[PDB]
Amino acid sequence: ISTMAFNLNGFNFNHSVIDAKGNVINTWADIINRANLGMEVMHERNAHNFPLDLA
Amino acid sequence: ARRTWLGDILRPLNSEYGKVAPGWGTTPLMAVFMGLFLVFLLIILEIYNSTLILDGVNVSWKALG
Amino acid sequence: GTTGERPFSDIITSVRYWVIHSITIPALFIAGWLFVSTGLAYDVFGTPRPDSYYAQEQRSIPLVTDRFEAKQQVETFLEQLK
Amino acid sequence: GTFNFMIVFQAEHNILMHPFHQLGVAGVFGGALFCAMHGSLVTSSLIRETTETESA
Amino acid sequence: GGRIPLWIVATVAGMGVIVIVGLFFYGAYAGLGSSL
Amino acid sequence: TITPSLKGFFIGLLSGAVVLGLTFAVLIAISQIDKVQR
Amino acid sequence: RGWFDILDDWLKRDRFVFVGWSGILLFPCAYLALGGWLTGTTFVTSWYTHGLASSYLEGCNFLTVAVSTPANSMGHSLLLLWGPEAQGDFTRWCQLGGLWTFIALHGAFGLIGFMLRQFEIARLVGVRPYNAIAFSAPIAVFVSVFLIYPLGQSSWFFAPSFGVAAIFRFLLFFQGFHNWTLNPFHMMGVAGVLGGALLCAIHGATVENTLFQDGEGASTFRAFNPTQAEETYSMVTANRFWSQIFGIAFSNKRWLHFFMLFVPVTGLWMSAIGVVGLALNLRSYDFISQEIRAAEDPEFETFYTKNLLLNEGIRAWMAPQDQPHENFVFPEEVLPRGNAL
Amino acid sequence: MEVNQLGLIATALFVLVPSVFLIILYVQTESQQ
Amino acid sequence: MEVNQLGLIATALFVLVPSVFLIILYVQTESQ
Amino acid sequence: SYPIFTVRWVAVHTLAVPTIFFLGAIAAMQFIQR
Amino acid sequence: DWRVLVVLLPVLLAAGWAVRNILPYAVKQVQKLL
């Protein structure tokens, strides 16, 4: 918690697997990411005016 | 202890406490029926599971007509 | 104290031990290696190769949607790459 | 409020994919394991000092 | 019996692990699973 | 009549019997050779 | 002096790895559960059941590999190798998710095996069977979560998949769909697991800091002998410390160690119960009185309403890719989103 | 708030019955001594 | 019948509290 | 005089043999390219 | 197919090599079993 305080975050394997053409091949990490997205977009739903939640 | 009419009549049915047949007795026969009962439960489970499918056995509500 | 098996620290500091295992350990390593480098692992287990998750102009998952035809469904999808 | 903090933490930091939270889970799972183990091993080897009508 | 000394067996095994796991982290950045 | 899945059932059932009997044959064998001295 | 007794003689010989009668069940099943997991995570895809890569062979790492659940369309099929789905074909068996049932079911009989082994060894060595009793909590968790829960749902597909990140997805699924953090059976489980770790640390720390000086070395570990009669640390001084520090202390070594069994075992049993409820979607999802107020009063807001907005986001943003058999198509305009994000 | 009216009595009995059971047993333990 | 909702708790406690008092007094009488 | 082939011998090799083989397969994998 | 013997050859050669280095003392052990 103390080091995620300075935004050194958990491993990101979002789109780490792609196929011979370049298609993304989802893994369980990308499914985690869909859940993380739904938390992100909803939290403090009136509080963000700009596109990145930088803190 | 108190004797009662009904007690005197049932007495023989609670009078062989501790009596055993020697050695292994019927254990091999018990084992056989255990084995048959397991396969029997296997079949029943797998029919319900639709892992075992049988002619004329439609495991659905539509087996009421 | 002991159940009469030969102690491990006696075995792995022993010369006979390493005489056998300097062969058996690399050979196994190379066997597993060849299992993959030959492509055999792919075919045994059915794992897609990087070029065979999708067909060229496809972006649908070839998802099994039937229980008892499921084996047939997979085979259908696999033909749609050949 | 606690749960709100931990859901938002996951969205902003992916804490579950962070190895220090994984060690924390191993610290807490393992602690509960070894708590039970130790309690059960000691309880298992209590020396008979009592009758079956009294708490050991 | 006790010829090959234990400290040496430990060091060589040890480096053999470091090498295998090294290769596994190298492959996180190369080839399949590298995002590239 | 004997459907394909009833066939697999017996296949599954014979395989289990084999694995189980094979297992116990070996265990009885070894136990007979390597007895405890009393 | 017949064959059964001779085999008994041999199964119960004192050797490096004890076997026992329970070993016949345990060791095959444990080794196969464990080999199935290692095999699947190294070589087997989840492409046809989940639309997911899930093996080292496909490019996954230790955190993202998994043996994933069968497709939803399999229902609760046992998925035997010789069954009507795979029809004896090993390759298709792997591709349909047969390794999941393989691991789950061999795993369950191995867990039985293991607890029978704790019973068997306890009886031979002459001790009371409490370690076996305690292990009932791990079994309750395993069966309720990996078996009872998907059996109340539509299919094995919604069971946990055997994998690190896959289990993380299961955590988040339960938040968004079941509001499981609100469930008091989870809360009692949390208290038992966190209470266990506390008790583990505080008991170790106490013993180590009320040691009797029994040797002359700065390393105090040497000054113990497992056959000494005497207690190796002062219960009297430990009791005084905690009484003065915390108000109350243990005074009975037996109660102490029983309570260390009791606390985490009971917590795990409680969490198993709540998962049995969730098998039926019998969730502690809402507080009715809160919803009635909030529906009528748009200035009313609690951490409880804020968390359901997050749940609603989780459901809509993850369901299409997490439940592919459902063909969810959510146009952009229907996704719940706050401002800007 | 529109709460389940029976929540009160459920909670009162939930507390009272098992507590009273323990108090009864404690007091008669003390009078043995 | 639109009766008083607190009537139940009032009756319930009315019985319970004094009955429990008596039962406590009685059990510790017998155990000495 | 110690025996060579024991129940211990089997437990050990029952795990070590596939492990080394699996480590070999996984090392090859680091050189697969898409 | 052919890939199966390629994979399997190092496994046989490995076990063949161990069989020949150990055989003398494996014989002895077996004899001691009564």
Add this chain to the structure above:
Amino acid sequence: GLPWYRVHTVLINDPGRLIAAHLMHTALVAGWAGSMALYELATFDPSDPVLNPMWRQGMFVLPFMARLGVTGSWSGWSITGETGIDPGFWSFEGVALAHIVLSGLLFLAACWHWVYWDLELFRDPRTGEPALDLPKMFGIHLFLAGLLCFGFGAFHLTGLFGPGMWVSDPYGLTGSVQPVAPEWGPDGFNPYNPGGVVAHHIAAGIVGIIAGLFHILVRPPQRLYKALRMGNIETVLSSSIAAVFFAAFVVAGTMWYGSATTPIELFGPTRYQWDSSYFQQEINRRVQASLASGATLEEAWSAIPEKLAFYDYIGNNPAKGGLFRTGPMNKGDGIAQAWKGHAVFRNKEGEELFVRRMPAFFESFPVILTDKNGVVKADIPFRRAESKYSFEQQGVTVSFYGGELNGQTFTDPPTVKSYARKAIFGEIFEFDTETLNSDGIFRTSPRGWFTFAHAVFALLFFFGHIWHGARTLFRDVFSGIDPELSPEQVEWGFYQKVGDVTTRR
């Protein structure tokens, strides 16, 4: 003193007072059944078995009396909706009454057996000590069980001397109590075949008679007597608990998946019927069949019995409830009054659109309208600003066929949206929310509540099996291990065989 968790161990060597306590337990349980029934009779509304059946009213024992042939009240009503019946003495009320009289009688016997605990029947004639010959007792009780099991199947279920049991058609429309002929062939293991239930009880009834007779006459082998501690009554409690949690898992399962003994008119639909659109398929099958024969849309849907339509509604899905959402289903969505009719959505180009149905996992679900091929053509947008598919833009209308709103069409967008919001639940009903002050949130059916209880009790009883089994096999060290257990018996090597002192090296 005894710890509190051990007070009932004073009965272990006291067969009479053990019988007394089993009698009191049986009294309390009989007493509960009668009390519960009388409460349900006092709360049950029998006036509409179509939209307010028992299983919407939180009825729990009413379905169990009905299942075995009790269907009428002394008040003149029956659960099938027949009126002016005369059930005889074996009405719901008379069943309740009997259980209360039984409970009274069991209470008095319990007092007699408590007082006259010291009966010579319970003493062993040789030693004079209390002793129960548990192996013979098993044979006796098993022989009894088999007689009862046989008679239940041969007379009650067949209707030979009895009412039969609840049977219905596949869609739960026409249920009633009927005699059932045994199914002796392999379909008698089909859980959905009622004849199998008959055959089971006859066949297993004979096997228990034969097995009981064996267990009366044949003594247990010495090996098994010792192994299983057959002079110890706690070994019976251990095995009995195992059989009971086995039994509880089976009845939870068949309650959840459904079988011939858990019909949907007594317990409600199953979640799988929602999962597989079971009732929707039958309804569509019927409407098509009406249309092929030249009926109009209005006529094809008006022929759909309201009872079938009400099954095709998620609020009757037992997997839509919550743990602390208490009471009957009616307390939530209300008392159903009328099918409103089948809603048909179309867009401005006249294409039929289909509301995507809510799945049971989702507390909330968006409103998405698809064409026959699954292409999104309308929704209710969240963010309005870049919406493409609003009802307002696509000109979505709703038209009703059958039911209350038959022949009515609606075009104002907020009304059209209101119906599409209900259409995700399936078929649309008018509900009375005022009478019970319904809060609008889905509750589970007695099918749900029964499964939850029995699955939970089964799991808990597993620990009970483990506990009492441990206690039976380890009775000799319950109070602690031997204070003269020497370190040679736990240290490695000394004994070739673990714990066996005859194998010292």
Add this chain to the structure above:
Amino acid sequence: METITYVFIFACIIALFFFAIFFREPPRIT
């Protein structure tokens, strides 16, 4: 009524703390 109930229970727990600490069975040695 629910606020009163919640606070009442919490208050009983605090009173119990006081008796548990200052009116405990005193631990006595040997």
Add this chain to the structure above:
Amino acid sequence: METITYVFIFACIIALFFFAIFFREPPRIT
């Protein structure tokens, strides 16, 4: 709920009669 309450209290009284009569303190001559 009030019907149940009235009947409950009445039922408790009938049980008390039973115990009051059949489990009285036996009167004895000292």
Add this chain to the structure above:
Amino acid sequence: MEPNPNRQPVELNRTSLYLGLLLILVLALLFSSYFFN
């Protein structure tokens, strides 16, 4: 007829009273919110 030999005293020490009251009060505190709902 002899009086019953199997009767035993029961005990609850003061520490068990405290522990049990704490258990009940905390359980009430946890579940009461779900009973009011």
